[PDB]
Symmetry: D2
Subunit: 76 residues, 4 copies
């Protein structure tokens, strides 16, 4: 379906994405902007989060398989 | 000096760590707890951040070299 | 000059990409597909494997001239300063 | 049962570790040190390399019985449910 580059633009626009090939069920990613994160100092940058399979919110770490996969989809 | 497992316990205690082998200068990590992040719903988990070389705050992604390295140190 | 998604297309075509915003110098990524690994280590039998054991691996030629498995950071994934090694 | 730092000690000793909290089944990590890679691909000359080109690589035996380069997630790094493959 969707590539990771396409899934990123969906994330940069505020929607939630996921991979059908993931082992965990009901997981998704969402991107929070630097302005929303604050709510010559260093400023925040965009951060991708992950809602895990056990209903927990962590900072997301992409696997090599995630980045190369073609099975991304939008959370409906 | 310090291993990554030792550097993690320093992070879990609120201090800042870094690797001397990193290419970027003046970078460090810090861990924010789930309680501090909020400020059958999914709850936050601990998140490791990184102050980058260009004074930006991102979610940290460990390289394989980071995890196996022995050159960790505490920010003084 | 290009995003990470565009750099992935360049990576999947056997080319090398890099970020000008990286701290280290003379670094680049390259992709070893499952078929490339099966062929390079297959001794002429790789075309008959159908299901190789090694998945796709992205490598990074680091600043120390070593070769590591590349871990995509959120800064790299969200960056817009990717380019092709010329 | 053990933390990630303890699992790293087990990894650096040639043993395999895993997380009971992982979603996939029958998965484990294993480490290929720089010396192991230089020896296994060196054809009896690996002891004379001094500075090998390949760094240490952590691999993951994934649920599909494939072998990938393992990317340490923040959940894995902070987890406390690591154990040794028996
Ligand atoms: N010896 C090595 N082995 C494996 N990978 C390496 C590496 N050296 C650099 N990388 C990676 O290659 C890209 C550019 O690296 P650099 O930006 O030039 O250096 P630095 O940012 O200071 O590394 C610190 C942070 O960068 C991130 O990984 C970087 C980054 O994705 C990661 O989060 C790390 O904690
Ligand atoms: N085919 C594969 N190739 C490479 N690595 C793979 C993999 N399958 C799983 N992994 C990794 O191995 C550990 C346990 O994996 P699982 O927990 O059993 O599955 P899942 O969490 O749903 O993967 C989704 C998220 O897990 C994270 O990576 C996982 C996780 O570190 C990563 O952030 C990913 O976005």
């Amino acid at each position: 379906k969707m590539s990771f580059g396409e899934a990123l633009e969906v994330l940069k626009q505020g929607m939630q994405v996921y991979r059908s090939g993931w082992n965990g069920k009901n997981m998704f990613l969402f991107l929070k902007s630097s302005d929303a994160l604050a709510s010559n100092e260093p400023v925040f940058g965009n951060i991708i989060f992950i809602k895990t399979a056990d209903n927990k919110i962590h900072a997301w770490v992409p696997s090599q398989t995630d980045v190369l996969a073609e099975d991304w989809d939008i959370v409906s």
